[PDB]
Every structure is written in structure tokens, then in C-alpha cells.
């Protein structure tokens, strides 16, 4: 139904069609109230408009070489390159570049755009046989996501459990099968951290009644979102675009997704009462082996933005001349370079998987995940220790600049160091502040550092990849070879010299 | 005079008297508008009430042992202990404890309360001879600050300069003498980072026309503040106390202070067209040698709060059971302990200064300044890597809890791990979020890491203190002694063995 | 018997008496050979001489005000201040200063000097009633250690266990009671990390047969040490004092202590088949609450040395003029200052304990333990990144300086930046290298970072101290007070303003 | 000529031929004595044997697919792949893999093997026109290095200068032209950090008399090395292979190289009295744009080794079971992965340069240089906090294991946690200790952190590369676009909503 808002079946949504497709009476709450229409609501309307611009870019003739491919479905249509299964390392590189072009439309700040779950679509299309009796659902969902550009999110993090409650009552907390019918399955439960789900068409949701994976439409009866605070709405109500230039347009609301007696049609079921497939899906389904290409590129585009924003901030404060400041900026550049290089390795070392599909280099994926929190924390610390005074006393509002009684003083006392007027100085530094210190900036720090999992778990996943791939045993073979070349009596290889002719310990002792 | 709002001259303001003293038509702007009355304005009214609670505490009988001393002026009155010159190490310890008690009333979140510039009053009273012809102004301001509890701030950071402008035009940016008159001096210019000046009575403001230090009242004609965004107002307009429990009451607005043709009477001048005294004041005036006792204790109280708030957050999420989580919490405890220990050393190693006054240990002050940014950054990182999942999806509003259509789901899906209901879980985690992630939390991170100087400069000040005190030369004497005990021919001291009897190099190489 | 080498019972050993007391046929191995005499052996003779200098300092008239007190035993003698129980905060401060004076005789590099276990002596004398039937042994050992200056070490770390061995055979690994006799107990087993035990008189060694604490003489039959590599001997055999100025005189050999059928007289037993007392000893015995005063001061003296050595190294390389270098040096100063300040707090906040004894502030002890590894790692990193080129190419040997064919080039090409000749430049930088990069320097990095326990365990001990003392509940009371002042309907205290008059959410939504 | 020790001109040295070529009476000092023969001297003989094994690998049939290519000279011979100019991204990838295979023969511990300066040979062969009148010398040296596998090092770091000396006297410290003759130039001066030059055939050495670049043979009269302490000799004299398994065979002595009246024939001169070419050579000559491929791969191979050695050490101590230990190991794996990934990017993003040659990605080179010191420091810290107790008390010597009076106790008390006997436990942990804590280990820490420049300078080089490439301006164009989309009156683009309909500030403040 959502794709029926398109005027053509041979291309994805335009932005205008996407926005119309959201006017479906989805059940969303924020600040204790029901949201009538996400495309007009003060908490969501600009974020929706920002996503709609991504869809518009797909149809600009000058963008289509970098953004789009023909579909592989026989439709005669086209789609964003990352919505179609890659069949070579170069395909992955072209997808890398198409993701980057989309990411640049939000300067790297929207991390859960439609291309993130395009990797889920492609995993379905590349390995549909994984799903057994639901193999045809996988194939059909791949085709649908690819041709239409359907916006998916995933809701996968389980709600907290009160350990002191009876084991009776806590089975109601997790997503669980309630009833099996001929029309599909009825499910109830919740998932937390449903980031930007208010703007999606579908969410993937992932005792055998708990071992499910299925697709849920956002407008299905019983599907509800409970929103977190809206940095977009607060910036609109008490600020301005000048004062909160990122909060006002790129806020991705991290919701709780609730399912209350929701009917999931059988066509939307992918794994059903199946602990074994649920267990193997992360390794074998492909999604976890593919989405970090998007996530790494998106972060790299954000680091492009932050790197130059730091340079511009240091230009206007005048400290960029100093050697130590330039060295700090150079380290930020190195971190920015790192994530582009990891995405290079992802594509260049890609491997054949199944049915001709290629997967990016797996070690590079795990490495991006471990390094990103450290890099982001270090960059934020570099920014704050270099743009010291300049951020703390910024005037409250564009209203200060627009009142000549106040502006007369700002014009004298808050100019930029490099011939820059006060309006441009304050503008640049307010952009940096919205990037790192606003509530939006603080949420993004949380997102970049912890969202991918706990620091232990991401390091364990890195170790497990090295072991499962055989890389660790290959490294161990080198250590074992080294140990084999000597023993407690001396060398065991002929090319090295016995030290008996020079050993002085007998003489000494 | 602001202190004439008191019903008695033998004690500082009560909270109600302090609030009345602020209703003086000071000129403050925020969001393009003039503020009518800071005690009722949506951007300032709770922060003002929060400071007023500090004044109220001074008059509670159960608080006076820890908070108050008699004045040393002969007035028969009393004051907060840090407003009177300390004359022993134990005096400093009592002041340390009185600062701590006041700091606990904002849980460590208000950093520019009146006790901060009480150290400026005491510096004036302890070394008034520093000021030459203005020595009597120093004595009189000490007496006035001490007896009244007048709220001072300092505005000292200079505004930025456009280097491409002519040298004419940019000299108007700094505070400068414009006119010398019989009634005082007329001055214009600006200072940035006038933290909480909207709630103060006076600010200290510090080619000889630029070499000035003087006191300016907040209600003087031509003194103006241009405010930054108000986290208090935003939290009031789009949130609630439950949702922003710190933003809503402890926001200290970091303003730009503008002076436009302000007449400063001669009794308010402390340094006048005097580069030499301006240069020597940081070392010799005493203020810089005394206020870090207040700042270190205030930070330590905040770390008390953050330490236990982290523990409570880990209780809520259930991860406190884990060894690695308990170790992370234990490191936060160690950082918290560090700043209390530094303040112990400040008092125990205090030194006689001038006129019977004592100064806290100088090395401890420099050390606190270097360590605080690293500790705060490390603690914030520990918090985020331990409690993040719990913070990211918190419902928007107390309004969600108060709508049963939503609360029915929150009650089921967001309970605490330890038998705790969802209201208390969400409450604790929203408090942690306001501490570290809200715009208020982000400002406080900037404040703790950056306010005190650049990272280079605070380290240079630490090195210079070690050198100026003679500590570095004493350390160097130990290295020189070590070097003196051998040379290229062997040991030069008799108690160690020549290695000639065991050296094998000739055998190996000849 | 060892103290009978003294010519007087009213003072501790002189250095010469101490050295004679070591010539007792203790059983020590190194490099596969038995050590005849530690005071003349190439691996130990200079370290022994270094310790002997500590004993000599006790008898210099100009040193006795800072180093010595009258004994509290009625002997009419004197002793090092830290060997006598402190009865006030000022006593602890005087002990702090007496420890520092001894530490300066090794420039902070000997960490297991006799004053470390003087705290064990004082714990015995302050709380002898802890030991029940062995209370009189505690009293008698306090008197003996205090009057004589007996050199104790502790051997407490258990050897590793092969988990695949039968539970039979692994009971022989740990120290265990073998036989109870009227002459004492026979024990066998081992302890690792018996640091400098080769130069001690006694070691404290700490199914009920495993729950023991007792004192073992180094010359008891069946007591044996297996030494690690001797940096002293290697520096003597292949270097010189000029080339290894710290290795050659301050090496504290980290031995394995073996007990093979050792008879421990009953007078040497302190805890016997007593799991309860073994468990409570760390909290209640006092030793763990007292020795970190010595350890913190010793580290602070070492940081005094390293701080000025870094400054001197940067003077001779010429980089001290640079702002960033001076800032790095200033951070080293701050770390150095930190440990002196912690020792100040230890003394100033000291508390009455039992029998009039005072204990240093407990939180300060735990804090020193957590901070020291981080500070030492950071300082070493600051040194290496600032004294870059200057360390890597230092000529091999004082023999190079003493051969004019080589010295003619060193004199031209390796001068100091500040008018300093090549001999002094090379000398300073070789001292820095021996401090951080030699095998001795690497061992000291290991010692400062990990010896006090694992990074987790030292942080857990810090948390437990805060909880056990009630500090954590006091901090929690402040958080609870904050939470009590509002609820989901608004403030619960009268002094703050209700936001109902300014709340805009109804209008917005 | 050293290559005349080969039995064939159509391949590089064998190991035995390389060792014979070193028996040339080069002038090397160590411990105050002249070295007679580096291939037999106790300070150099195993390091020489270790390098010789690299040459032997080139001629093993099972190794030649990964190690060797035909020469491009028309000689009909073969060479190590990194000794021939790369003409595509795939060429660089094959070279990357050939470097890795050689690096594995020292487990990543020898960092100045012959393939390091093979990039200098290739730079000469790819851009010989850079050298003007010496272009033909560049071409000829490329041919010679490529066909023979000649072992070059570079000596480029200048000796320290005493600033208190007269300006006369300190100009004799640097390498300088002394005499211009028909047979070549006579030069004197010194360079420090001539790593492993004792085992090389030639060194590149790089007021116009100071602006030189030339090649000097190690056996030229007047060329001398003054060695640092030999970890190989000390390990041989006072240890054993079991006790110091890396020190005993992989020590690369960091010498001072002295030139005293050395005649450099004109065929060995590349830049002569030419400040402009000296200044431009780092950017334009190609060597600096090519050798970091070798250095990054060599480091990655060492991290392969250290990663698994850590795992094996944690197996020995039994702590690998613990979650926090496995996480620490996983971070070491991530750092190891990083440098392999950087080398992937170096090859995949390679660019056409000049004369058909390709250069590796420049940003990746700069990134490797900035990241390597932080990674190595972090890894060493992870190792020490996980395996320290196991390292501190290891028995002194294989002699302890071989004396049954001692071994009886070691067999009981120092077993491995996982059914491993004491000999193997002690062996693994002594290998880890030689890697990180021995004097060799400490030198390698200095080498990985500091050799490449100061921490400031390597970051500045990274920034300059981003600016010079145009990358920074492209990033800045994105920031400028963002700024262009709004102003102080609202949005300037049509797709976003004006907030005038929801802005509440007038209501709040009017």
C-alpha cells in the first residue's frame, strides 16, 4: 500500500510521494499526546522533509550515475545502488559511493536513513534459502524494498526486566507469539531504541514463542510508538535554525516500539518459533555482514563535516595559527581518514558469499565498530579543548542579532578573528555547539559511542571474527613457528649461532 | 545599597532579602528582549531562588556551626566562614567544610555562588597594602563583603579581536578608561563569560588606559548583560522538573558583560592606569592563591553526587552486579576521592602569607586545575559506556506517565531491574541525563574542562609554580647528586663495588 | 640471631653489621647456580650495599631528627620512626618524612626497603589481641623488629595451578601445614614475587591446613629462593655504572620463595589453621591500612627524581624552550604533586584505631593505588614522546668515551644543546634510559603498574572502601534528597517556581 | 663490488653470498673496540644471519610466487617484487604481499630490512628526471638495486648542535661538501640513527655546501659506525635463546654514522649544492610516498605476532576465560586489523604518478603514521595489565631448568594453567617479555612510537596532506553548504518548515 502513492512502479518514491505515504494514521505519542500527522507535527515535520530530500535526489539526472542502478527484478526500473545485491567488489565500491552521496544530504547526521535497512533487503534477496518455508517471503520482500525504496528500520533491543517480579508476568515484556491464525500471527511485546521509526513504512522485529523475526507496518492496528523528547520541536519552539541548525532538521527520534495484539500476516513472517534460525541469523543471514558498510560510510561523512567545522571554528577564533592546535586538527583528520580507509578495505577485500552475492571484508566491519567510539570520544575532546571560550558565551538567539539595541554591542565585541563579522562567527560556533553540546549533540555522542553495543561486546565480536575466520590460528602459527626454533638447550635451526662460545655465566658464577 | 534590604546589619542577607535586592532594574537581555525582574523572569527565577536558599542556610541554628563565624570587624555580627580572612591551617579547614555545606545545597552544580568571590573579599582584606593609594578602598570592600555577604562575580576574559581591522577601531573592544573626573572614572568595553552575573550585586572587572581593576554594581547605568540561551527557561517551557531536574533550578547563565559610559566612583577603583600592579596582581594579590580551594571543594561535592548517581543508575539497569561495572564505579570513586584529598592538602600544608593571613598549599591548587579536566572527561566516558542503552530511549515527558493510555505500556516495559517501578527508573535516568547529556550537561562539561584556561596554560602554570617555589631545583638537586656518584671511569663513592672484577667485555671483544 | 651482629642493643644495625648478618648460608639460586654470599655475589652485592646505606643513615647525627625516634619498648634505644606505632596524625606526618628521607637514598628506585614491612611490625604491636593465642608472638615480634631494624619482606602471591592436573597433586603447590610438632610446624609450598627477599632477614608468609600466617627466617633449612635474571649482574658484566647507573645499584630481585619441609617455631606463628582470622586480617590486622603510606611516599620520591630527570633531559636536548614540551613537563609535575598531596591527606585525616594507634586516611590509600598505574604509564609516555631521537642512538659504552679514536667523534657530534659537553649529555640520557627503557626500567614499569593487583581489583577495593566506610551511603543520601524534591507532577519543595505558568506544550500540541 | 659475490647476475644475493659480501673491513666500533667481521662478531652475527635468511627465501621455488617478479631491466633475471617499480594498483598489492612474506621471517621484528630502501631504488627508477644532471645516476642506481637486491639504509637525522658554541665550529657537525674534485666530492659530517647500517652495503645520505644527497658504501675509507649497546651480544653473553628469543637474533643496531674525508664518486651523487631540490625531494622524489607501504605492512605483521603471543600468554596464565580479558584481546585484534586495512587502502586507492608508475594512497600513509604510536602504546598497556604477575618472577635462566636441584621446584610451582608444563609456560612468557620489557623490547617501543617524527609533526603532516590534496577544501565545501541553507531570519531553502508557527518566545517574553 505505501508504494501505491508512487505515480510510477519503475522508480522509488519521490520526496512528495514519500511524505504522502506517511499520512496513514500511525499511532505515535509524544509529550503525552497523540501525533495527528508526522509530516506536519512540530516534532517530526522537518526530519520527514530531510528524509524526503533523499528520495528526491534519486530522480535528479545529475545524481543518477552516482546514486542509482537498474533494478535486478526485470521491472525496467531503477533504485538506489545499495538496495540491490552486490555481485563484485566493485559493486560494493559503487554502493559505498552511493551511500556517501545520500549521507552528505544530512552532512552525516542522520544515521538511520532508508539505506541502512536496504542491507536487510539485500540480505533477504541474496540468501532467501536461509528462511526455509519462508524463503518466498524473503524473495518477495527483497523485490518490494528494492523497487520502491521502502523505508525500514529494525527494532531489536529488548525492554528491561524487573528481576524481583514473578517469572509469571515477565513473559509479557518481550515480543512473543500470542495466537496463530490462518490470517497470520498475533504478537505483543516491545522493543526499545526504534530510531526514526516514526518516519518509516515498516520495522523488522527480531520457549519457542519468543523466537520470531517478522516485518511490521507502522500503520498496523496495535503498533504504537512512545517517543523520546524531540530536539526538533524544542529547537522550533524556543530556538531558530540559526541557533540550532542541526537539531531543527536532522533529529531521529529514538522511540519505544509497542505491539499490542498486532496481527502479522504470514507474508510478513521470516523466522517462526525457531531458536536455531534465530541463533544463526546474525552469522548466516548476511545483514550483520552488510549494514556496517553503510554505517562506516555515514560516520566518515559526518567526520568530513566535523573536521572542516573544527577548522572553520579555529579560523574564526584565530587559534589555527598555533602549532599545537594544527596538530590537534591533524589528528582529527587522521581519524576521519581512518574510517574512509576502512570502507576502502571493506570493498577491496570483499568475498563471494552465496548466489553470486559479495560481502564486504568482515574484519574491517568489526574494526570500524571497535574504533568508532574511541575516535568520536577523542574528537569531541579535541574540539572542546580547542574551542574553549568561543562556545560558552554565544548570545541566546538570532533575536539578539535582530534587535539593534543588542546587535550594536555584538557587532563590536563578538567579531571573528579573521576579518569575519559577528553574525558569521556566532553562526559557525553555534553550528559546532549544536554538533557537540546541545541535547542533540549529546544524544549523538551516546549514539556513536554505545549504540552498536557495549564496549566489551564489540571487542568480543572482533575477537570472535578473528577466531572464526581462521585469522587467529594463522597468527598463532607464526608464534608457534618462532617457539619451535629454539629450546632450553639452544637453537633448533642451523642458521643461527650457538652462544656457547660467548656465554660468560660459568666464568661469572 | 543592596545590603540595605537587610532587616539587620549584624548578619548577611536572608534569602528573601537577597531576592528583593535583585529587583533593581539592572539591564539584562535574553532572546532579544529586556528582562523586567530576574527574580520572576522565566530564564532566571529558579536559579535566583536556588542562590537565595544559600543565604537562608546561614541563619538556620542547626547550620551555623558548619557555615558561620563571627565577623572580624567588631560589628558583633556573623558571616559565612569563607568571607573572613583565614589565619591558620585549621581556619582554612573550617572554611573548606563551610564551602562544602553550601555546595551541597545545589548538589555541586552551581559553581559561581557567592563564596567564590568571597575569596576576592578576603584577598582585599588580607593584603590591602598591595593597592597603594587605593589601599583604603580594599579595606572598605573587605568589610562590606564580609558583613553583608554581597554576591560578587568577576568578569575578566576579554572579547575577541578582528585582526584584519585597523589598529584604530579594535582598541574600543577592551575595557578602557574613557574619562577621568572628580566623581570617578567613566569606562567602556566588554568582558565575556560573566557566569551568573545576572544574579549578582557587583562584578570585579580586571597604553595605561587599559590597565584597570575596579568594582561595578549590576544596576549601574550603562552596565548591561547579553545572556546566552537559558536552559532553565527551555526546561520550564518544554519540559518539567521531573524531565530536567537540574536545568530547571541550577542554570548559571554565562553572559557577555557590556559597559557603555559607566561611571565608576573612586571608592570602587582598586588598580588605576597601572601595568605593574595589573601584572603582579595574579601572583601577589592573593585571589588566585585562594579561590581554587572553593572551586576544588565545589567540584568534589559534584563528584560526590555524580558517583552515587552512577551507582543508582547501575542499580536501576541491573548491571551493578558485574565485575567490570563495579571496577568502573570504583575508578569514579577514586577520582572523587582525589579532589577531597587535594583540598585536605590545601589546608594542611597552608602557609603564613601577610598580616597573619594564611594561604592554602599552592602546589595542590595547581594540581587540582590540571587534574580536574581529565577526571571529568574520564568520568563522563565511564558513565556513558555503562548506562547508555538506558538513557537513549527515555520517554519524552512526565506527561507520558500522566496519560494512562501511554503509562500502561511504560509500567510494563520500563521497570527498574531491582524491583523498582518505571516512574523511579525513568526519574533516576533522566537525572543522570540532565547531568551529562542535556544542553545544561554539555555546558557543564565545557565548564569543567575548559573554564580555568587552555590545557597547555594550566600545565605551564603548574610547571612555573614548581620552579618559582624552588621545588624543581630541589628535585634537580637529587638528580645532580645521583649523577655525581659515578663517572665514565666507575663509581665515585666508596660503598659500591667496582665492576672491573666481573666485566667480561675484554674477553668478549679482544 | 641476626641482630646479635650489632655491637649495641640500643640502636638498629649499622650498614656493616647488616651486611655481616647476611653471611648466613641462606640457600639462593641464580643462573642455575648456588649463591655463596649475597654480599659479595655479582648479582646482589651492590643492592646489598645500597640497603646497608639506609642503616648507616640512622646513625648520622645530622639525620637523626628526621629519621629516628626513641623506641617505645623501654630499651633506651632509638629506631627509624616508621618502626614504632604512631599515636597521632602528626606522628604519621613525621613517619611520612622519615620514609621520604630513606627513599631519597635510592632516588625512589628501591621499593621494598626495610621500612615497607616496618608497617607489619607496627600492625603487630598496635593490634596484638587480634591474634588470639598468638598475641604474645605479635607483641614480641613488634619489639624485635622495632629495636633492631630487622629487614622483613612478605611473600604472599600464590604459584599458578595446572587446572588439568588431578585435584590430587595440586594441594602440594600452596603453602600448607605438613606436620605439627612441639618444636613448631613443618610447612612446604611456594610463594612468587618475593621481591628483594635475598637481602632480608625474615619473610612473612600469608581445608584449614592452608590458612596460615607465620614468619620464616631466610637461613632456615628448607627455605630457598629461585631468582629472576639479575639486572645488576648483567650491568656489571656487560656495562658500567656510567652506562647503567640505576641497574648497577638498585636492582631488587623478584624471586620465587620455596619452602621444602621447613620447621617454623611456634614463636613465629601468627595465624594457625584459622580461615576466619586469615579472612579478616586484611581489614582488621592493620598492615594493609598502613603500608601504602610508605608505598605512596616512595613513589612520590621516585616522581621527584623522574620529573627533574625529564627536565634535565629536555635541557640537554634543547626542546625545553618549546611551549608544548613545557606543558608536558608541567603535567608530569602535576602527577608528582598528586602523590605528595595524597600522602598529606593520609596523615592529616588520620583516625584513632585501637590501643591509641592512628591509621592514615583510608580513602587516600585506595586512591593512591588506583591512580599510580595511570600516572606512571602517562609519565613514561610523556618522556618517550619528548626525548625522541636523544635516546635511540646513545653510544654503547663508557669504553667508547675512553677510546680517543671514538671519543674524537662523539665530542664533536653528540654535545648537549645548552653548552654541555658530550660526556654529560650522554650521561644524563643514559640515566633516563636506565629509568624507563632498560630491562630494569621495564621491570619497574611492571612493578608500578600491576604489582599492587589487577586494575579491576584495585578499583573494586576503592569501591568497597567507600561502601564499607559509609561514604557511599552519604553520597547516596545527597542523590536521594535531590530526587525527593520533585515528582512527576512538579516540585515538592516550596521555594521553586511551578512551570505551569510558562509551559507551552499544550499550545504546541 | 658487493654484488660480484653472486654466482649469477640474474638473481639477487643468496644468504651465503650476502654474508660473504659483508666481509669487507667496514669500520665499525662497539664497546670501544673495532669490529673485525660483522658476520662473526658477537654483537652482529645472528642479526646478519637473520637478514641472510631473507635473501635465501628469494630462491626457494615454493616462495617465488609470493616474493619475486622478473626484473624490468631486460637482464632476464628476477628480484623481490618491491624492488621493481609498480605500474598499477594490483602491482602494489602484490608488493604489499611480498613485503609481508619477508616480514614474517623475522615475525615483524626487523624493521630496516632491504625491502625498506627498495622503495628508494624504485623512486629513483620511476622519477629519474627529478635529478637534473644526475638523472643518469638515478637510472643506474635503480637498475643496480633492483637486479642485485643491494641492502641500502638511509642516514638522514642530523646530530645535535651546541647552541652556546660560536657559529664557527658547529657548522662542522652536519654533512657538508669539503672538496670538489674530478673524481667526485669529499664530504665530512655525521648522521644519527643509522639503524642496522652495520649490515648494509650502502647508505643514502640526505649555504649550498650542506644541500646534498648521495650514496656511500659501507666499506668506503672514512665511513665509520659508532654502535649503540648490542642486545644481541648481551643476550649471548649473559642469557640464551630460550631466555631472549628475539634479542638474540633480530637486534638492529641504531648507530651513529660518521664520515671523515670520504670521497663520493660523481656516479653516487644525486643532489648537489641544491637547496631547491633538497626541499622538494620529500614531496616530489617519491620515496616518502612509497616506503610507508613497507613500514605499515611490517608493523601489521608484528601485530599479528603480538596478538597471538598475547592470546598464548593468556592461555598459559588461565585468564583467557574472563570476559574482560577476552575484550582486551579483541581490542588488540582491532588494532592489528587496522594496519592491514590501511595497507589495503594504500593499494586499492593508488594513483598514477609519473612514467607509468603508481603511488599508494597518500592519506592512508599519513594515517598509518599518526595511528601507529597510539596503537602500539595501547597494546603494550593492554599486555602489561593482563599478564604482569606471570612476567615478574620468571626464573633467571634456561640454566635453572637444566639444574635438577632447581627444576624440581619449577616443575611443581610454575606450570601452565591449561595442562602445560613449566618449560613451555616459562618459554612463552619469556618470549612476551623479550617483546615488550627487555631492553630490546624497550627499544622497539621507542622505535614504534618515536621513529617517524615527533607526535606534533606527524599530525601536521597529516593535516598538510588533507589540505594539499584538496580534501580539506572539499570537506569545507560541505560545511559552507550547510551554513548557506539558513540565516538569522530562518531557512533559505524551500523544503524545510519555518518555525514562526511554533515559536513560543514572544509568548514567554512579551
Residue numbers in the entry:
A (entry chain B), C (entry chain B): 2 to 207, 217 to 519
B (entry chain A), D (entry chain A): 2 to 207, 217 to 520
What's the publication's text?
Among them, the HpaBC complex from E. coli (EcHpaBC) has outstanding activities and a broad substrate spectrum. More interestingly, we found that EcHpaB is also capable of hydroxylating a series of phenylpropanoids to generate a wide range of natural products. These results indicate that EcHpaB has a broad substrate spectrum for the hydroxylation of a variety of phenolic compounds.
The Km values towards p-coumaric acid, umbelliferone, resveratrol and naringenin decreased from 137.6 μM, 217.0 μM, 174.3 μM and 349.8 μM to 132.1 μM, 176.9 μM, 144.0 μM and 191.6 μM, respectively, which indicated XS6 has improved affinity towards all the tested substrates, especially, the largest one, naringenin. Compared with wild type EcHpaB, the electron density of residues 208–216 in the loop connecting strands β32-β33 was missing in mutant XS6 (indicated by the dashed line), verifying that the loop in XS6 is highly flexible. The sequence and structural analyses indicated the increased activities of XS6 towards larger substrates are most likely caused by increased loop flexibility that is beneficial to substrate entrance and binding.
